[PDB]
Amino acid sequence: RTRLLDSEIKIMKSEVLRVTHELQAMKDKIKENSEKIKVNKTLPYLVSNVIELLDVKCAVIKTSTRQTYFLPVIGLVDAEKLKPGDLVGVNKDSYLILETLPTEYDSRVKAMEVDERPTEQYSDIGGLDKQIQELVEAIVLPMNHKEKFENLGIQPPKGVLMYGPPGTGKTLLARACAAQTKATFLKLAGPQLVQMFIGDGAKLVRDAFALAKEKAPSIIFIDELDAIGTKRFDSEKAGDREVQRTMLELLNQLDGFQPNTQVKVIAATNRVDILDPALLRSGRLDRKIEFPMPNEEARARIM
Amino acid sequence: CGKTMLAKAVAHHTTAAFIRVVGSEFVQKYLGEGPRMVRDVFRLAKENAPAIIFIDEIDAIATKRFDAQT
Amino acid sequence: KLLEHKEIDGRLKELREQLKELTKQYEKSENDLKALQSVGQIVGEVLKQLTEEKFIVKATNGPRYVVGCRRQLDKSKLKPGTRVALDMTTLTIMRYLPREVDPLVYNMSHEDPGNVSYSEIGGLSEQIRELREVIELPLTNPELFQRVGIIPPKGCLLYGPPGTGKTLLARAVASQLDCNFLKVVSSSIVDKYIGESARLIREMFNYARDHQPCIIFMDEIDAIGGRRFSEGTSADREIQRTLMELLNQMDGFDTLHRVKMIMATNRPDTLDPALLRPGRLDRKIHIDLPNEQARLDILKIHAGPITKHGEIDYEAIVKLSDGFNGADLRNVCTEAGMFAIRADHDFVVQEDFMKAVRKVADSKKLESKLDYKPV
Numbered sequence: 001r002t003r004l005l006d007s008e009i010k011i012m013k014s015e016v017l018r019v020t021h022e023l024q025a026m027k028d029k030i031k032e033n034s035e036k037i038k039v040n041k042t043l044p045y046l047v048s049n050v051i052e053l054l055d056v057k058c059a060v061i062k063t064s065t066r067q068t069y070f071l072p073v074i075g076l077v078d079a080e081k082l083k084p085g086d087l088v089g090v091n092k093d094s095y096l097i098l099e100t101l102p103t104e105y106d107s108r109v110k111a112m113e114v115d116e117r118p119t120e121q122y123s124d125i126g127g128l129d130k131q132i133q134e135l136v137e138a139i140v141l142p143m144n145h146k147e148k149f150e151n152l153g154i155q156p157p158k159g160v161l162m163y164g165p166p167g168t169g170k171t172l173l174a175r176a177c178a179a180q181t182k183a184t185f186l187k188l189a190g191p192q193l194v195q196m197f198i199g200d201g202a203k204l205v206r207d208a209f210a211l212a213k214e215k216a217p218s219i220i221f222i223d224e225l226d227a228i229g230t231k232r233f234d235s236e237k238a239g240d241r242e243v244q245r246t247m248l249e250l251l252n253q254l255d256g257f258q259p260n261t262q263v264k265v266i267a268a269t270n271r272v273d274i275l276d277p278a279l280l281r282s283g284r285l286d287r288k289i290e291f292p293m294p295n296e297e298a299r300a301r302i303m
Numbered sequence: 304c305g306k307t308m309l310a311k312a313v314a315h316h317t318t319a320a321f322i323r324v325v326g327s328e329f330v331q332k333y334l335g336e337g338p339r340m341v342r343d344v345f346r347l348a349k350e351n352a353p354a355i356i357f358i359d360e361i362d363a364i365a366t367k368r369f370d371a372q373t
Numbered sequence: 374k375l376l377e378h379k380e381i382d383g384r385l386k387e388l389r390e391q392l393k394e395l396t397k398q399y400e401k402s403e404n405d406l407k408a409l410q411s412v413g414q415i416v417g418e419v420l421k422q423l424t425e426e427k428f429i430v431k432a433t434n435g436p437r438y439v440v441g442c443r444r445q446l447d448k449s450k451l452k453p454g455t456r457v458a459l460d461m462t463t464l465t466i467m468r469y470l471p472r473e474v475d476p477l478v479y480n481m482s483h484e485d486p487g488n489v490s491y492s493e494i495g496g497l498s499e500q501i502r503e504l505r506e507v508i509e510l511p512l513t514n515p516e517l518f519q520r521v522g523i524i525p526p527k528g529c530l531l532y533g534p535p536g537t538g539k540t541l542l543a544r545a546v547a548s549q550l551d552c553n554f555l556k557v558v559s560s561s562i563v564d565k566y567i568g569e570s571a572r573l574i575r576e577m578f579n580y581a582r583d584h585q586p587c588i589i590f591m592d593e594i595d596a597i598g599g600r601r602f603s604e605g606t607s608a609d610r611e612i613q614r615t616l617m618e619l620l621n622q623m624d625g626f627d628t629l630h631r632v633k634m635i636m637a638t639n640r641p642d643t644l645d646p647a648l649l650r651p652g653r654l655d656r657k658i659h660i661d662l663p664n665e666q667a668r669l670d671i672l673k674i675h676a677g678p679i680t681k682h683g684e685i686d687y688e689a690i691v692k693l694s695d696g697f698n699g700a701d702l703r704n705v706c707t708e709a710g711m712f713a714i715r716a717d718h719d720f721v722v723q724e725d726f727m728k729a730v731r732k733v734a735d736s737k738k739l740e741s742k743l744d745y746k747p748v
């Protein structure tokens with residue numbers, strides 16, 4: 001029975017190890033949580049957009065107060081978490097980053113979301129079935145069927161463009177898609193993008209063009225492109241720069257450097273002329289889609 | 304027609320203090336930086352000696368049709 | 374009898390192990406705990422060095438201050454315009470740093486990832502070769518350029534009908550070349566903060582000026598492209614300067630070196646005289662609508678990955694296909710593809726082609742004026 005008591009004596013000395021660390025646990029297990037709550041618990045958070053992530057573990061940041069402070073202790077926040085333009089909790093006193101924040105995104109942009117979600121089915125309509133197919137056929141299909149397109153080696157049309165009389169019925173089609181396309185509906189007015197501050201239109205478009213890229217899939221509806229859609233003259237004395245650039249900005253978004261098939265872009269305009277000729281093309285909006293004033297039966301159908 | 308060359312030539316053969324300040328730099332993200340510079344370039348000009356202050360594209364500064372409100 | 378060593382080591386191994394497992398957590402976290410007291414450090418450029426220790430530094434976040442050095446910082450290194458870490462109470466140098474690049478020079482620098490090489494496109498080895506020589510060569514084969522007595526090219530500007538293959542060129546170039554292409558859509562550069570577009574441009578050329586060689590590729594300049602006035606809104610004044618900011622850098626006093634610039638536009642009719650001029654833009658690169666050859670040439674490139682029974686009507690499609698740009702053709706494929714998917718025929722043919730082609734050339738009537746030459 002010696003080795004029993006011999007391996008027995010070990011247990012308590014063995015137990016010491018675990019038993020003693022439970023002390024060593026609480027020791028830091030409390031001070032860890034303790035001070036962290038005091039410094040972190042500080043619900044005041046001055047968000048600061050990172051700039052340079054110098055690894056010489058250093059990194060500078062500019063505050064929401066527009067103040068640059070080189071913190072030699074990135075503090076709570078892994079490198080990866082690190083990169084420029086990235087919301088950060090910064091203890092007000094310390095400018096020590098507490099938390100990482102989600103990301104920027106315009107309160108003017110968020111209003112482009114869709115909670116109430118229309119309720120217009122299709123039968124609501126009438127006579128528009130030609131394009132209603134197209135309407136579907138350019139978004140729903142390419143969305144709920146991306147494996148079929150390549151199995152024929154193709155590519156899916158990049159969004160559509162609605163035009164025609166101003167009473168035929170197009171906003172319903174949007175309404176129709178909005179209720180149908182379970183995808184995150186992105187309805188936006190062409191006028192809204194029209195702003196004062198020399199940098200709201202581009203920003204908002206980017207903001208809207210990003211918000212969609214982070215909720216795939218998405219159909220962004222753009223009522224009356226004319227709002228932001230109009231050829232660009234070339235005068236001297238004065239001339240629309242914003243409405244142009246915003247278009248440009250927008251243009252540079254739809255296509256241009258870096259492609260994207262995560263977002264569907266559907267723009268109606270009571271007048272498909274004023275629109276500049278770098279919005280139509282075929283890449284920007286693939287499908288030019290007429291809305292002809294209806295016949296009769298369709299009329300009989302609407303009434 | 305060769306004005307920016309003319310400044311390069313002068314800063315070459317020159318002998319005084321050629322200050323190359325761009326009129327597009329004067330306006331910063333601050334409410335006084337501009338005058339603070341001009342008082343500097345002009346202050347520095349006095350100190351240096353017969354100095355050439357040169358402003359390439361004064362348009363960025365002086366464009367008459369101002370608009371106090373924006 | 375021998376089962377005890379386990380019951381000894383069993384306890385031991387785990388016990389002796391789980392000991393450090395949980396002990397290390399305190400060290401790492403503690404570092405995180407300790408580092409807490411640790412503290413921000415003001416930033417600024419040295420305006421100048423009053424005395425060895427006396428410094429005139431304009432807070433990077435505001436006004437100027439008289440301050441001293443630290444000690445082992447190197448009073449010699451501290452120099453005018455040098456960005457330094459500064460103190461939040463002592464308000465002295467907390468440690469000199471280098472020239473940042475803002476959070477915008479990364480997106481156009483390390484970010485914009487080009488795609489396939491130049492082979493991906495074509496239809497006109499005209500600009501492909503023409504640009505390459507101006508742009509690529511004057512770098513790896515400029516050492517002999519002086520043997521002719523000619524400075525490397527300055528800048529190159531695409532300019533063509535919307536869809537001639539411009540934006541696809543910048544991608545092909547940065548993909549193949551690879552060096553330091555920083556793409557500027559010339560739109561997201563604009564902000565609203567007096568000279569917020571002056572700093573972006575400065576950093577762009579500064580970063581590059583130091584980081585050169587670098588390719589500068591500006592997507593749509595018609596923004597800052599501008600043209601000046603006499604005049605327009607108080608807004609236009611901002612752009613101009615900004616529009617000029619670049620112009621003064623591209624030429625002015627300090628002479629661009631290594632760092633080259635691709636100018637992008639659809640419609641060059643809008644641009645300022647002072648920009649097109651050599652010393653700023655060397656030779657303009659036109660990209661016309663693919664020829665019947667160029668079409669056919671491009672047509673077999675986008676429709677190449679399509680299931681097509683021994684009926685490919687390439688000579689027919691291309692034929693009817695006139696005035697059709699490079700995507701008007703792609704669309705043609707994509708269009709037919711919808712006929713392809715359409716009704717039901719996983720395998721396309723010569724039917725879902727023409728239908729598209731005219732269809733693709735039918736709506737093309739809604740595009741008045743698609744050409745605009747420069748000067």
Ligand SMILES: Nc1ncnc2c1ncn2[C@@H]1O[C@H](COP(=O)(O)OP(=O)(O)O)[C@@H](O)[C@H]1O
Binds near residue numbers: 124170
């Ligand atoms: N096929 C249709 N069936 C029923 N209503 C229609 C139809 N086409 C148009 N409308 C009517 O038009 C209105 C929407 O007009 P809309 O065409 O969206 O204006 P705009 O084209 O200027 O946006 C709806 O109230 C709807 O009742």
Ligand SMILES: Nc1ncnc2c1ncn2[C@@H]1O[C@H](COP(=O)(O)OP(=O)(O)O)[C@@H](O)[C@H]1O
Binds near residue numbers: 309624
């Ligand atoms: N007579 C000349 N001698 C030398 N260079 C000339 C002459 N005329 C024109 N140039 C060239 O044209 C360019 C003129 O640039 P510049 O007049 O500074 O343009 P900007 O007015 O836009 O600054 C210089 O590169 C210069 O080499």
Ligand SMILES: Nc1ncnc2c1ncn2[C@@H]1O[C@H](COP(=O)(O)OP(=O)(O)O)[C@@H](O)[C@H]1O
Binds near residue numbers: 534540663700
């Ligand atoms: N020469 C070409 N070869 C292949 N594809 C082309 C060509 N030209 C245009 N495209 C199609 O259009 C796109 C290029 O459009 P882009 O040249 O950027 O128009 P823009 O000049 O208006 O920016 C490509 O993604 C491709 O699908």
